[PDB]
Structure 1
Amino acid sequence: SMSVKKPKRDDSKDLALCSMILTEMETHEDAWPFLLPVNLKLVPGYKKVIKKPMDFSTIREKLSSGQYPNLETFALDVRLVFDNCETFNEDDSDIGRAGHNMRKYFEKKWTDTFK
């Protein structure tokens, strides 16, 4: 509350560390469904169904331009990529499996870097 604060957690490296995580997600062999925005002209149903499209290149541009206020807004966009994937793709599909694999990969890096 006013003039009453928990001890200051050092967040000065968060930007660099989210960049490193994002690099590792970018270079994973199962990243290919997620590297670029879904083409809304060429994929029937996507525009109407997925209210907030997100992809790794969009996260990279947001990260590089100071559009994440803190490390949690960064995690929310990464998770959005996988949530969108599950919304549109069957689990038993190459893309559906890719999304589960990448979500697992991300959540481990996230816990190990920050928790």
Structure 2
Amino acid sequence: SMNPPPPETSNPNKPKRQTNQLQYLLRVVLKTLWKHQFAWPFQQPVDAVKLNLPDYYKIIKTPMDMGTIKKRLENNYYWNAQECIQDFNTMFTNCYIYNKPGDDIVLMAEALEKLFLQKINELPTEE
């Protein structure tokens, strides 16, 4: 019934680098989604206690959200850009597992995901 702790966001044992694509993921991809009118359900871990969603963490075992992704980027948690992309994909997939078609949040997720995929199609040159 209780909320789990949030996902890890900083691990000093993981190696650290800044790359063209990671910069783009934070400063273009995440920034653009974050400022979108539909971002708010996705800006923090799902607080299933406060939202009265007792089954959320019974169903969703790999939670992910843009607040966590932002902190992971800021703490150099990801080495490869595709690790970050995978976390965005996990976030969207979770939404489509937990929520039903026609639910407002699904329309929101679909719009944000289409925007995400469009921005990923302009991923910049790798080192």
Partner of 1:29: 37
Root mean square deviation, CA, Å: 1.6
- Given candidates 35, 39, 42, the residue that maps to 2:47 is 39
Contact 2:21 2:123 in 1 (8 A): no
Aligned residues between the structures: 105
Larger Rg: 1
Question: What SS class does the counterpart of residue 67 from structure 1 fall into?
Answer: coil
The structure, 1 or 2, with the larger RCO (C-alpha pairs under 8 Å, 6+ apart) is 2
Question: What SS class does the counterpart of residue 122 from structure 2 fall into?
Answer: helix
Give distance in 2, aligned partners of 1:108 and 1:114: 13
Partner of 2:76: 66
Instruction: Give the aligned residue type for 1:38.
Output: V
Instruction: Give the aligned residue type for 2:107.
Output: R
Instruction: Give the aligned residue type for 1:18.
Output: L
Q: TM-score, normalised by structure 1?
A: 0.85
Matches of residues 88-103 of structure 1 in structure 2 within 5 Å? 88-103=98-113
- Kindly state the Cα deviation for residue 93 of structure 1 after the two structures are TM-superposed: 1.1
Please, which runs of 5 or more residues in structure 2 have no aligned partner?
1-17
Greater percentage in helix: 1
Please, which runs of 5 or more residues in structure 1 have no aligned partner?
1-10
Instruction: Give the aligned residue type for 2:37.
Output: E
In structure 2, do the counterparts of structure 1 residues 104 and 86 end up closer, same or farther at CA, with 3 Å as the change threshold? same
Q: TM-score, normalised by structure 2?
A: 0.77
- Kindly state the Cα deviation for residue 114 of structure 1 after the two structures are TM-superposed: 4.2
